[PDB]
Design a protein around this nucleic acid. Sequence first.
DNA 1: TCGAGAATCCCGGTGCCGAGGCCGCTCAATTGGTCGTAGACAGCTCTAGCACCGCTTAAACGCACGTACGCGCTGTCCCCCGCGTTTTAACCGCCAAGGGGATTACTCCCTAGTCTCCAGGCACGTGTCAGATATATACATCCGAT
Length: 156
Amino acid sequence: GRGAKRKQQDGGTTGTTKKARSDPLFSAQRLPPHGYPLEHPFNKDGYRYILAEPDPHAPDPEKLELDCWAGKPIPGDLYRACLYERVLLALHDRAPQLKISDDRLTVVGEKGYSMVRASHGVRKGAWYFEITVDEMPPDTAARLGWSQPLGNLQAP
DNA sequence: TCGAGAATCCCGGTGCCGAGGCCGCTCAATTGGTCGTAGACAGCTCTAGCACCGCTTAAACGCACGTACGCGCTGTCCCCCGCGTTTTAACCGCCAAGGGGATTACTCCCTAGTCTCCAGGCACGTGTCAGATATATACATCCGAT
């Protein structure tokens, strides 16, 4: 009856394993260390993992004690890790090697190549915006421009 | 080859007394001469470790072998320990004291040092016997016979 936790820890057989790998310097995210609005950019380019907008699930996996998420999930009212009005870049489709401020204004890269994408599309209207390059040390490429989510977040 | 339970590591999260650094106030470490001297240089004397060889034999060399036991294996059985319990004084922190350990001051007396002469203990002969050396023997022991 205690094998369910081991199955959940090893990885199970539900597709991708339950053992995250984001080994570059990942910061500016994953603030609340509990079951709340969270995010995990993954090593594998193209993995977006988020917990905001929660959901219940079916209880009683292996006739253990009744889980609290049976029909009445626990509530949550705290920090949510995203932005609505105009996403300053993003917090979901990113690489786990980018350092951003708490207010999400500055972007600091890794020892190697890195990028940040956004989460807002443009179809009509004026979007005359700016990227103020605070500083650029030698051997630090600073190419900027629009791209697509299909783009590999670590590819040049 | 795989779980349940059981432990340890670490992330906070917080409160506290020990290493630290500054100020103030000493006491012994230099500096410079000064004075006596211990050892360094060169010479000469003597004596023995070394190179050398001769001849003799006690002992090392190496084979032969027959068995004593070191070792692997078995079985055995018994008691050390881990788990649990009840049981209790080491440890903590608090009191109070008197006594004696460390410090001050002092007078006094034991001793380093000098000078003094004489006597006894090591270098050096010299006579002499205690025990090693080789011979013959009663005896206790390993081995072999029953």
